[PDB]
Design an enzyme around this catalytic site. Structure first.
Site, PDB file in Angstrom:
ATOM      1  N   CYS A  49       1.070  -1.144  -0.260  1.00 36.31           N
ATOM      2  CA  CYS A  49       0.347   0.148   0.174  1.00 36.31           C
ATOM      3  C   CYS A  49       0.816   1.131  -0.320  1.00 36.31           C
ATOM      4  CB  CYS A  49      -1.378  -0.040   1.382  1.00 36.31           C
ATOM      5  SG  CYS A  49      -2.162  -1.134   0.762  1.00 36.31           S
TER       6      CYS A  49
ATOM      7  N   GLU B 146       3.173   2.935   2.528  1.00 36.92           N
ATOM      8  CA  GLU B 146       2.470   4.351   3.478  1.00 36.92           C
ATOM      9  C   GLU B 146       3.273   4.240   3.957  1.00 36.92           C
ATOM     10  OE1 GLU B 146       0.471   1.203   3.770  1.00 36.92           O
ATOM     11  OE2 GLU B 146      -0.257   0.688   5.560  1.00 36.92           O
TER      12      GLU B 146
END
Length: 717
Positions: A401, A403
């Site tokens: 993802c 992050e």
């Protein structure tokens, strides 16, 4: 062992009302509620939170050294606050934690509390880890190591980001031997036929000779990893002195499809997916026998592995920005459909980079590739705290993802907070973020199977306190969106005229205080425990599933619409359907999947009637970039995960914006705002009037009705 009493739980349940979203309870029941064989039913919310909280608190290392009476009571009270916070849904750990925290599987499985990892695809030593090939010494480097790491974490249900930068691929030696491979699955196995279909041979058809290498796979996850590790390492002289080119892998012991497995609600896939993976992985290697592996070959092997785990029912490949073969690998339609779909690909860049022209062209087509600025990631925490040489110098990539800034073998370690909801539940945010920080910090003391992970974690103690429901929190508390407008200006280097965003200065203060709260919390707890302070602390993750539990906007994302009919799909046999039907919810057969039922949930987004309310389809691409930049500048010292969606009429701005934020964004992910028009949309927009009418049709409390039916009807679940 720290624990919560029934007396305390009943008290919380009496005064705290879980802030479930319209789809919340249902989502919880079919996602995080474990089955209780003793009681013949699935868990209730209060019960899940109890084991999650207890599971985390009992990780505190001090509890390992004759804990004082005061220590145990202090921890007990902290756990009680934690329980009250999570039960109310004002904050929550990761979905993985909700599913496995405090379980027997968790306690008997290393790495079980972390769901994402990163690993460089370059020959490495296995070190003193749970998994170590018999033919390998501990400190001996092997080509199979990074693949074994990825394979293992993937089978443990996590996601794995990996790097095939040219610099790593060049470290992989020439493919010395083309291996002859035979996969055996005895005629007796319950998976014989199925396996023959994918390329395995019966014990009768097997062609063996004295010189062949033979391996009987233990019916375990490690058995699978070691078998792929053996296959790979036999292609290189460094790990194959005997120059043996005859391998026979026996998978007669692998449990059949549907077989019960430990650590998942689902079952086994059978050896079939493993057979194909070994055969295809051997081809990629053989096809380059005598030659060299490319990033495409390295990524294909990782993809084939990921594909075998998904089976018949989670990766990010990061390569070099000048590696055109890698950048174009997912465009090959045939191979995309066969396995390259397994990972999402991105390229590594630095602030000096400006070759966004071809990158933008790719993005306008399929939303790929993504971008990761390793330069900014290694030399910055929050952009506001300025350039700090090597502050995160061990960073080599990120998780799927994107992050978290990660080093080789390092895991993500997240906790999500919903500011608006925590506040509405009567909490002081500063205290919420401090409990969050400590929860995460504790996870770092859990058991880890790989040496490299233990070492890096010991040095970093990285935590990732995420902030979700961000748009709801700001629109409500500010009356408008963090980006109040744009003013003229020029590029700091090229002097090019550009539109810079004007941020609501109120937002800076509120996020800045929360950041400092997490840092203070980590500093003090680090002292008490006597460990290293977290190298990084914050991030933003658009955790969809968990955000649905509380009905919050996901990460920094905007709502799909002010008023919508959201459709949730259920198997026609699902125990929850009779209860939903009994409560007034509208249902219909799903047209996209056989034997499935759609259930319509009317939903109103926070600030739906605010003129400053913005739906994802109407937010300009320029504003989305500015919003991500804001959080990266004043909140996250890790990265900021978010999918920037744009209309085709905005595609002309993609290259421009990527260049504009080259000094701020650590990672970027864009996607053409698709949609087109779905006949049975998962999210259908409606006006306020329709919403009110529809919600009035639902006058039944599904949670209560389900429990009542479950009681009156035996074996409902």
């Amino acid at each position: 062992e720290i624990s919560l009493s029934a007396e305390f739980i009943d008290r919380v349940k009496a005064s705290v009302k879980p802030h479930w979203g319209k789809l919340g309870w249902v989502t919880y029941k079919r996602t995080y509620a474990r089955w209780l064989p003793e009681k013949g039913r699935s868990e209730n919310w209060d019960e899940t939170v109890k084991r999650v909280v207890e599971g985390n608190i009992n990780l505190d290392p001090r509890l390992q050294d004759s804990p004082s009476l005061e220590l145990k009571q202090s921890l007990t009270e902290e756990a009680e606050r934690l329980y009250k916070l999570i039960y109310g849904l004002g904050a929550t750990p990761s979905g993985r934690n909700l599913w496995i925290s405090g379980t027997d599987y968790q306690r008997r499985t290393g790495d079980s509390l972390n769901n994402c990892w990163f690993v460089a695809i370059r020959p490495q030593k296995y070190g003193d880890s749970k998994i170590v090939p018999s033919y390998l010494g501990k400190q001996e480097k092997a080509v199979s190591m990074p693949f074994s790491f990825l394979f293992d974490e993937l089978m443990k249900g996590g996601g794995v980001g990996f790097s095939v930068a040219r610099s790593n691929i060049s470290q992989i030696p020439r493919v010395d031997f083309a291996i002859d491979l035979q996969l055996v699955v005895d005629e007796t196995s319950e998976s014989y036929d199925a396996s023959v279909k994918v390329g395995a041979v019966g014990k009768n058809e097997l062609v063996q000779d004295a010189d062949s290498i033979y391996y009987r796979l233990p019916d375990t996850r490690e058995g699978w990893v070691l078998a792929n590790a053996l296959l790979i390492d036999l292609h290189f002289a460094q790990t194959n002195p005997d120059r043996k080119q005859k391998l026979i892998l026996d998978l007669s012991d692998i449990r059949p499809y549907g077989a019960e497995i430990h650590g998942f609600g689902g079952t086994a896939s059978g050896p079939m997916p493993l057979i194909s993976m070994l055969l295809d992985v051997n081809e990629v290697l053989n096809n380059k026998a005598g030659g060299r592996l490319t990033a495409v070959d390295a990524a294909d092997i990782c993809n084939l592995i990921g594909k075998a785990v998904v089976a018949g029912n989670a990766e990010l490949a990061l390569g070099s920005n000048d590696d055109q073969d890698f950048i174009s690998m997912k465009q090959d339609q045939e191979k995309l459909m066969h396995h390259r779909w397994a990972s999402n690909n991105s390229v590594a860049v630095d602030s000096a980079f400006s070759g966004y022209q071809p990158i933008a062209a790719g993005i306008r087509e399929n939303g790929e590739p993504g971008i990761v600025n390793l330069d900014l990631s290694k030399n910055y925490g929050r952009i506001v705290d300025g350039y700090q040489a090597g502050i995160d110098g061990d960073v080599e990539g990120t998780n799927p993802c994107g992050e978290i800034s990660l080093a080789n073998g390092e895991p993500c370690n997240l906790f999500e907070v919903f500011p608006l909801i925590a506040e509405e539940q009567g909490w002081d945010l500063q205290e919420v973020f401090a409990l969050a920080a400590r929860y995460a910090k504790r996870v770092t003391f859990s058991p880890y199977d790989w040496e490299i992970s233990r070492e890096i974690i010991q040095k970093n103690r990285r935590i990732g306190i995420s902030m979700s429901g961000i748009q709801d929190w700001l629109l409500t508390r500010l009356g408008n969106r963090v980006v109040t407008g744009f003013k003229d200006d020029f590029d700091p280097e090229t002097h090019e005229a550009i539109k810079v965003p004007v941020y609501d200065k109120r937002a800076i203060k509120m996020v800045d205080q929360l950041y400092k709260a997490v840092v203070k919390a980590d500093q003090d707890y680090s002292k008490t425990l006597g460990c290293n302070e977290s190298i990084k602390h914050t991030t933003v993750k658009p955790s969809g599933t968990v955000a649905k539990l509380a009905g919050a906007s996901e990460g920094m994302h905007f709502h799909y619409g002010a008023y919508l009919i959201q459709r949730i799909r259920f198997q026609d046999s699902d125990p929850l359907l009779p209860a939903l039907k009994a409560c007034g919810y509208r249902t219909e057969a799903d047209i996209y999947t056989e034997n499935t039922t759609c259930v319509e949930f009317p939903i109103k987004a926070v600030g739906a009637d605010n003129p400053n309310f913005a739906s994802a389809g109407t937010v300009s691409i320029a504003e989305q970039f500015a919003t991500q930049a804001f959080l990266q500048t004043y909140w996250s010292d890790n990265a900021v995960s978010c999918t920037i969606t744009f209309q085709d009429s905005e595609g002309d701005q993609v290259e421009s914006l990527l260049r504009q934020y080259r000094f701020i964004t650590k990672s970027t992910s864009l996607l053409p705002y698709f949609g087109g028009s779905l006949q049975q949309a998962p999210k259908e927009p409606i006006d306020k009037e329709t919403y009110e009418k529809r919600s009035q049709e639902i006058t039944g409390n599904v949670e209560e009705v389900f429990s009542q039916l479950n009681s009156d009807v035996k074996d409902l679940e």
